[PDB]
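Sequence, please.
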């Protein structure tokens, strides 16, 4: 089997991407944030505290003839941005882009933190990291990909995120028309439950490539590119007037600037992030200070190849017995 679904930016900045997902019988379609940095499929629901729902579409298990309470199971998750959610668990039929999993754990939110309530466009998350990170207790549950894997034509999914445009998540096949050149594959460590890999270096604009190992995670659920402070300083030093602002929470730059590109290495290959991808717009409405898309990972404890980086590539998440990642230009 295969599946193919379009993923759409939630706003004009590409702050996140939503993908329609069918849950239950008859189908209830919710727009979920596919997150290769976590491993829970959770949804706003008829059980979510009413004051914490503000415009999201909810899953109502009582209206699904295939929903079953997973008795005794609870979940609770906290994300790197400080947001969180928790609740109980149903199993139900879940389909993505024509690919169907029966008996998928659907984690129904009883509580969500303010940032989820305040984002009316995201109805929940669909985790695509390794199932060892799933938070369901006392019986850990499998991700949608883990459940689908054995049925797929090939044990892979691909992320093809757009810049200020829709893109595609494919399951079970590699669309050879969706990228240019060849795909360069690189080793993955699953020891932390992430799609963790080592970039071979970077360049800023037209500058020379610096060969240096940068361990980090391929994380579709993180907006920005978080790299070591040395790398990030070298980037922003090429932008007149850019500075790190403790009050804003990262590097800012004059909105009048033209940003240089940023290149990262994948083996001997190179992925180029155009400068425009690094502009996250005014820090507050009408400001001439703009927020940078490359930020320091110091204090986060891990480097994160988020959407800013991934959207410059066609990315293969290879879930073979020994997982690997593939990157191609596009």
């Amino acid at each position: 089997s295969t599946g193919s679904a379009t993923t759409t930016p939630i706003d004009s900045l590409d702050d996140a991407y939503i993908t329609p997902v069918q849950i239950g019988t008859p189908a209830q379609t919710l727009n979920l944030d596919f997150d290769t940095g976590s491993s829970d499929l959770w949804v706003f629901s008829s059980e979510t505290t009413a004051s914490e729902v503000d415009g999201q579409t909810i899953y109502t298990p009582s209206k699904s003839t295939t929903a079953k309470l997973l008795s005794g199971a609870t979940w609770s998750i906290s994300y790197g941005d400080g947001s969180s959610s928790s609740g109980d668990v149903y199993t139900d039929t879940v389909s993505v882009g024509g690919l169907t999993v029966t008996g998928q754990a659907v984690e129904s939110a009883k509580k969500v933190s303010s940032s989820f309530t305040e984002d009316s466009t995201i109805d929940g998350l669909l985790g695509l990291a390794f199932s060892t990170l799933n938070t369901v207790s006392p019986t850990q549950q499998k991700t949608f990909f883990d459940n689908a894997k054995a049925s797929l034509d090939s044990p892979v999914f691909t992320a093809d995120l757009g810049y200020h445009a829709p893109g595609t998540y494919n399951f079970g096949f590699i669309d050879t028309t969706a990228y240019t050149g060849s795909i360069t594959y690189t080793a993955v460590s699953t020891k932390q439950g992430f799609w963790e890999w080592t970039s071979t270096g970077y360049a800023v604009g037209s500058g020379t490539f610096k060969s240096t190992s940068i361990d980090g995670i391929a994380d579709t659920g993180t907006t920005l590119l978080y790299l070591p402070a040395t790398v990030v300083s070298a980037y922003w030093a090429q932008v007149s007037g850019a500075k790190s602002s403790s009050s804003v929470g990262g590097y800012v730059f004059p909105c009048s600037a033209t940003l240089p590109s940023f290149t990262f290495g994948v083996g001997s290959a190179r992925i180029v992030i155009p400068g425009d991808y690094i502009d996250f717009g005014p820090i507050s409405t009408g400001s001439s200070s703009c927020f940078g898309g490359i930020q320091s990972s110091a204090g986060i404890g891990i480097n994160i190849f988020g959407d800013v980086a991934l959207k410059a590539a066609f990315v293969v998440f290879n879930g073979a017995t020994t997982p690997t990642l593939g990157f191609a230009s596009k």
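The longest helix spans residues 229-236.
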